[PDB]
Design an enzyme around this catalytic site. Structure first.
Site, short mmCIF file in Angstrom:
data_model
loop_
_atom_site.label_atom_id
_atom_site.label_comp_id
_atom_site.label_asym_id
_atom_site.label_seq_id
_atom_site.Cartn_x
_atom_site.Cartn_y
_atom_site.Cartn_z
N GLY A 100 0.91 -1.26 -0.01
CA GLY A 100 0.03 0.03 -0.02
C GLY A 100 0.67 1.17 -0.08
NE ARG A 336 19.69 2.91 -9.12
CZ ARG A 336 18.60 2.86 -10.00
NH1 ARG A 336 17.22 2.83 -9.73
NH2 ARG A 336 19.02 3.28 -11.28
NE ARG A 560 17.54 -41.44 -10.73
CZ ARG A 560 17.25 -41.02 -11.76
NH1 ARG A 560 17.31 -39.46 -11.75
NH2 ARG A 560 16.50 -41.41 -12.80
NE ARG A 616 15.09 -43.30 -4.20
CZ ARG A 616 14.39 -42.89 -5.35
NH1 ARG A 616 14.26 -43.66 -6.43
NH2 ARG A 616 13.89 -41.78 -5.11
CD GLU A 744 10.24 -41.57 -0.61
OE1 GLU A 744 10.28 -41.20 -1.71
OE2 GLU A 744 11.28 -42.44 -0.34
CB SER A 763 17.83 -39.84 3.12
OG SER A 763 18.24 -38.95 1.96
N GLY A 765 13.40 -37.11 1.66
CA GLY A 765 12.92 -37.35 -0.07
C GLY A 765 12.01 -36.52 -0.10
CB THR A 766 11.75 -32.51 0.41
OG1 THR A 766 12.76 -32.32 -0.89
CG2 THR A 766 12.45 -32.65 1.82
CG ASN A 767 11.62 -34.69 -4.97
OD1 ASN A 767 11.67 -33.51 -5.41
ND2 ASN A 767 12.85 -35.48 -5.34
CG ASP A 768 8.01 -39.67 -3.48
OD1 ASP A 768 8.34 -39.45 -4.64
OD2 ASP A 768 7.34 -40.67 -3.65
#
Lengths: 872, 872
Positions: A100, A336, A560, A616, A744, A763, A765-768
């Site tokens: 604002g 700046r 993998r 894994r 995960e 570990s 597995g923040t994907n799944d």
């Protein structure tokens, strides 16, 4: 009391009273910067106005008029005199910069006589009446509430009437006319009151307005209620106006204290005589290099040079400055921290440290970590990119600039590259069979597949450009041609990819190469000194490993193992295993892969030379290893002495309504332990042998995917331990190993304490995990996430940026709980978020031992980690 | 000290010292029960043995020999005399009943002379030598460590040698022989030591053994370490042996204090003269009713009767007792709360309350809530069920006994039922189009579909039997015939289903009807007095509602709205909407359903008569509403003026890799708000009108499925509120409404506090929550859950029984967090777990306002709730 402070009578510590702008103006005035002189109406004066029932106290008004008189004396000329008229700018500013926005009014003090003196002084009547007519409008809009419409109609009338086409094409004589029409509108709105002809009425009007605008609806009410209540208000800053078009001894300019493109110390910039900033940016007149200013006006040049160095020293970093010279009097409008590039950021930081102007810590923290990606992948002239024809767009799977002749098969791309051509591989999707072509390509473009697709992942490992999931494309395999946007393209036709934006370009002009820089290497070392998080990488082959370690990787956070079953020479063994009907027939089929997989494992350890590696175990369902084409189904039935039906019955048996949450990962080892045993055999022999071969110690790390319950892991753990200890006996080794799990599955995080009782490491597995916490599949999320981002439901991609508020909670928890049962529990993160700065910083704060990312993001993590350590 | 206590010198409070058995024997001795007299070696004597280095203290031995002398005096005969030999039983017992079991040795005191006196007294030499040879074996196994093998070989030799076929066919003369062979084995194991001929050596041996067996490996170590350390041990209970085959004044029997089949007060049971319990169970001799005992031996009958009543009064509940009369002397071997049925449980409880023997609270708590299902669904002779031919099995979707002629189409089943036949509908799966047939069927059998399948859900609503997902079946639609197990079955051939076990039976014999009972109704009222949880139901039509309310339902916890788009007369409108390409064309197609849906809504409110109803907005993806058959795809293209391709392109566009986590629920409203608006219009007009029509007040509850983020809900909330308030304006109503959400997405539970800021109520959809917390789809879980249950990974179905340890955490949390922002936040549960007793109890404890279950489980919940309130 005292409601008016001159800029010389304040400083940064009186932020509360002068507002953020007012105090910053004061600060820069103390710095000896000849800012256009002015004063500030205090935020307490905003409180007094509201406690006087919308009637400014005579006290205040008087102290405003007093400060006005002061400015006049400095400037040597009255407020709206007929010779050299004083004009001012009114700007509102609160204690905080906030959502604002605040108001700005220019040229306050103009009127029917001042407009003339102004036209005489500048020698440009068109410029004078142009400003007047703008002021008249802006004042009427802000101070009173006359809509733009009334004014916009009249400008549209005159322009249309005189047959002119733009806001500019008006003559001095037409602006004079338009200004009178404008004044008539104000009078025709203010019950016959003339446009605030009085310079003082103008001032007050603007001062009243500012205070008034603080009480309006939405933005305002939110900011007051939530943030911090008490006595907030808004300050009014009143400042003298400047001009560089008053003559041949007058000018305006913009300069940098250091070169913003290369980072070389020394004044850089441009300027113009008898002009306003606009004219510089316009380049109609060839702007003259800043250094030539010493030839025109040495006195001002000198002063300019000193104050520039003073600014740089005060702010302690390359400054971008705007300046204006009015009749031989130098003024500074703005300063700046100037803008620059990644290579430049490093170079300047280093310089700044060597010149003793900043500490090493400070150098590190100030570099934008996400920028570093620029150093690793080539870029062609940014003009040529904008000059480039966009024929489509998709997902930015793997960053880079790729440009080359298109080919539709892994072999033709390789063969073409071998002849010396820049190749671009365009497919529906890739597979492990096309790996040789992928490596030989400058980039890869696919029709289907997201960030996790076979093309996106392999291309990040190889550090190769990749734009995936471009559905607009229509490949014709037989003809070796494909349609996209404006036309069809044939084999050999060149295209360009931008792996960072997802843009696809028609044409043939290659980028450059990936540049390195000691400054890079110097920063890394400083980063190391500061970071606590070790950084590992996600790597599936030796090459990738080597590149990762070359960029500082300390080991493999995620290795993998899918490819070890997928590849052409392996797939037959898995397939056979799948269609078997005996534990004995399964075990036999699986043993036939040991050699091939052990052989893969050897190579990894060879490349890691003692660095740790997290392996894994088999994560996807068996459905993916079976043929999906009646042709291959037939070939396989032929190979094992079965019917095409019998194979087809097996394939459909394996079919799963939601493959993301089926019979896979741990759940597969549970039913068919034989799989795990075999993977354990391969790993354990592979390690033992390389250990004997080099004497390099190894501590294999075995990670179980998709675990959700303590006893679940324990079942599988038992299997693996029995087998590992066997292999140890067989080769008479004392090699240590560790078994951990992936976190995960939400549950695993909720009962981490129980899970830890078996798992030696965790570990993330923040994907799944994200998929399941949010309750959606990445692959299907495209068809609304877009709508979500538009609607501001989400302001960040949760698959790209860790969701700290939601997902974070589980991670944090998992760690805290795991360490209650196993204090010395190591925890890492292996998802894509592992290379996301903000995610890393979270990971730091919650206590992870390390992060893991794709090889070519290691540098960003390394930096990110060091920053997080210094920020906390 | 004192290491030996007689049963008369103990009680229940000396559990620590006498063990659980010892104290319970004492207790029952105080109760005036003529138990075979005995004593107990204390658990402190087990501690003293271990603190003496495996050498029993002379002190202890002496006090054992002293107590032995006491028993002899009571019984009037020595330990192994030649006339009337005393024999005893040695039983081990700890302070706790526990995992890992304790030992029992019978007939202690037998030898070469006692065996003769025994054969003379019983008049059965075969029975005497049979016991001897068993004792010899059991002693040698337990006391020493001679394996059964040595003994099993010799028995197999003699049996095989004499050409006999079983453990029984031996003559008295052959057992004599076998006993000597057995003694030879012990001597041939104990370095020439004779079988413990000495009755005292036997005793001690057995006493040593008991203490010894406490230190063994697994079970033992776990129990000591975890449970409670300090000074635990094990007690040894030594008790006189009894016999009812010593003559015509001797007998044995089993009786109940009340009739276990009907619950009528008064002695019930059987007995036999000159026999052992075995002979009673054997029924070779027709056992004589217990009441006839008064004719044979009045004196004993009388005593028997008194003590029975004393037992019943002490234990305060129907007792099942075993008794033995030895030469006119009555003994009581065992007593326990007898077994019974649901109808019997109620009847007895009621009686027990009226007789003043128990409180109402106690009646309620003691009835097994899961049993109540028996009262609601018919059952045919349990002999006929076991006599029934099992041709397969599947999932028990909806409980009940169904039996009738098979038909393969909804219309043929209806038509057949209309002619007066019992019908069984067998399909691949059901759809809303087959609803008329389903209602007319006695049961429903499907080839595919789980608990959540169309057949399972509709059948629970209708209170109709349903066995689903029977893959073994092979339907031939055209021929109207299907193969399963042993044979093919044609239309009209009768079958039987068991909706409680999933069993399918070949044949034609109908069950009975669903019986009611005041006792039922009486319990309900008592249950009401005690429960705090209100119980709502999951209902989709008026019928279901009515049945639910008839069984105590207080309203609708979940009203699914899928069918309102699925039905034959609706599906065209949704389909049209789906294939449209304009917001305007979507809105128009959707408006055409309003009347049909509003009309559905009216009927519900009509049936609820003021009771609240939670309405769940559209939950499944659009993929399900589009035709999946090229035929229907074509029909639809014909209906809207499109190509078969163009429809097919739309269908595949909607295709989702994981439909459980796609574009559905809230996410669908986000993209196509038009859907929600329409559902809101229908609901709101429907309520307003019925309100005016009856004056019955209504508070509509609108529930948004699959919410994961505060702002997400808010987007949709805004839409619905704007529309609701419009409809209010249009009909000039002041009707209150509430908007809440489902908590089925882990995230929503984690940020419940934020979610609550908008959501006025929370409904736990524990179905979809479990799926996501565990990270699996119910429909795909079958192919390993089985393996998990076997392996003891899971001991309970998480979809059937709430997983308190894992899922529970989120629920608990969600509640706690929701009430931090909105203290007066109502929370219910609508999953299948809502009718699961243990789940309800959780729900109670964590603070939910109510539960919701399928109509015919309302009673179990109602009870369950009352129990939970009383248990906590």
């Amino acid at each position: 009391a005292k409601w008016v402070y001159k800029f010389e009578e304040g400083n940064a510590s009186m932020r509360n009273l002068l507002g953020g702008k007012g105090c910053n103006l004061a600060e820069m005035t103390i710095l000896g910067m000849p800012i256009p002189q002015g004063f500030t109406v205090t935020t307490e004066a905003c409180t007094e106005y509201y406690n006087s029932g919308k009637q400014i106290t005579q006290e205040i008004q008087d102290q405003i008029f007093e400060a006005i008189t002061w400015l006049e004396e400095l400037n040597g000329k009255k407020f709206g005199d007929t010779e050299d008229p004083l004009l001012v700018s009114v700007r509102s500013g609160a204690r905080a910069s906030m959502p604002g926005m605040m108001d700005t009014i220019l040229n306050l003090g103009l009127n029917d006589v001042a407009v003339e003196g102004f036209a005489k002084k500048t020698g440009n009547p068109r410029f004078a009446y142009d400003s007047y007519r703008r002021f008249i409008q802006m004042y009427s809009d802000v101070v009173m509430e006359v809509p733009k419409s009334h004014f916009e109609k009249i400008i549209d009338a005159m322009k249309e009437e005189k047959g002119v086409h733009f806001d500019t094409d008006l003559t001095a004589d037409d602006l004079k006319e338009l200004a009178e029409k404008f004044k008539a509108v104000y009078k025709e709105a203010m019950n016959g009151e003339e446009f605030p002809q009085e310079p003082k009425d103008q001032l007050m009007g603007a001062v009243k307005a500012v205070f008034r605008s603080w009480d309006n609806p939405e933005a305002i009410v939110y900011r007051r209620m939530n943030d911090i209540p008490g006595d907030w208000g808004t300050a009014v800053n009143v400042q003298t106006m400047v001009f560089g078009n008053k003559g041949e001894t007058s000018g305006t300019g913009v300069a940098f204290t250091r070169n913003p493109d290369t980072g070389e110390k020394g004044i850089y910039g441009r300027y113009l005589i008898n002009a306003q900033g606009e004219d510089v940016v316009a380049g109609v007149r060839t702007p003259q290099p800043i250094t030539q200013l010493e030839n025109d006006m040495p006195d001002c040049y000198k002063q300019f040079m000193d104050l520039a160095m003073k600014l740089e020293k005060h702010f302690r970093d390359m400054q971008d400055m705007e300046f204006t010279i009015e009749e031989g009097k130098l003024y500074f409008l703005q300063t700046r921290n100037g803008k620059r590039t990644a290579p430049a950021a490093l170079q300047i930081a280093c310089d700044l440290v060597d010149e003793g102007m900043i500490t090493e810590e400070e150098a590190v923290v100030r570099i934008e970590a996400k920028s570093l990606d620029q150093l690793l992948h080539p870029t062609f002239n940014p003009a040529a990119l904008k000059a480039g024809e966009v024929i489509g767009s998709a997902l930015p799977a793997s960053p880079g600039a790729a440009a080359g002749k298109v080919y539709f098969t892994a072999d033709e791309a390789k063969a073409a590259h071998e002849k010396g051509e820049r190749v671009i591989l365009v497919r529906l999707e890739t597979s492990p069979e096309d790996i040789e072509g992928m490596h030989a390509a400058e980039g890869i473009l696919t029709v289907r597949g997201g960030m996790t697709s076979h093309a996106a992942v392999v291309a990040r490992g190889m550090g190769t450009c990749c734009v995936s999931g471009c559905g607009e494309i229509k490949i014709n395999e037989e003809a070796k041609t494909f349609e996209l946007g404006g036309h069809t393209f044939a084999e050999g036709d060149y295209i360009s990819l931008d792996g960072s934006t997802g843009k696809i370009y028609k044409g043939d002009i290659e980028t450059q190469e990936a540049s390195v820089s000691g400054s890079f290497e110097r920063i890394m070392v400083w980063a190391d000194k500061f970071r606590t998080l070790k950084v590992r990488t996600n790597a599936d082959t030796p090459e990738d490993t080597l590149n990762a370690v070359k960029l500082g990787a300390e080991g493999i956070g995620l290795c993998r193992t899918e490819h070890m079953f997928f590849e052409a020479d392996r797939i037959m063994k898995i397939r056979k295993m799948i269609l078997s009907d005996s534990v004995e027939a399964r075990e036999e089929a699986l043993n036939e892969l040991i050699p091939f997989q052990k052989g893969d494992f050897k190579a990894m350890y060879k490349a890691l030379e003692g660095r740790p590696m997290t392996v894994r175990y088999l994560d996807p369902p068996l459905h993916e290893f079976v043929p999906h084409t009646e042709e291959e189904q037939a070939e396989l039935a032929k190979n094992m002495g079965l019917t095409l039906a019998e194979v087809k019955a097996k394939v459909d048996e394996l079919h799963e309504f939601n493959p993301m949450m089926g019979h896979r990962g741990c759940r597969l080892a549970v039913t068919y332990p034989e799989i795990a045993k075999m993977q354990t055999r391969a790993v354990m022999e592979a390690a033992i042998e390389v250990k004997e071969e080099t004497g390099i110690d190894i501590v294999p790390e075995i990670m179980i995917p998709l675990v959700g319950e303590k006893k679940e892991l324990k079942f599988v753990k038992d299997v693996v331990v029995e087998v590992a200890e066997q292999v140890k006996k067989e080769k008479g080794s004392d090699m240590q190993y560790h078994i951990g799990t992936m976190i995960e599955i939400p549950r695993a995080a909720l009962t981490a304490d129980a899970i830890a009782e078996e798992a030696e490491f965790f570990s993330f597995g923040t994907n799944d995990l994200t998929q399941m916490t949010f309750g959606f599949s990445r692959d299907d999320a495209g068809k609304f996430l877009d709508s979500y981002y538009k609607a501001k439901i989400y302001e960040s991609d949760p698959f790209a940026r860790l969701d700290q508020t939601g997902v974070g909670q589980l991670v944090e928890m998992a760690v805290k709980k795991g360490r209650q049962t196993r204090p010395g529990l190591k925890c890492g993160i292996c998802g894509e978020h592992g290379g996301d700065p903000s995610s890393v910083e979270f990971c730091h704060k919650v206590g992870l031992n390390y992060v893991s990312c794709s090889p070519f993001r290691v540098p960003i993590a390394r930096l990110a980690a060091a920053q997080a350590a210094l920020n906390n």
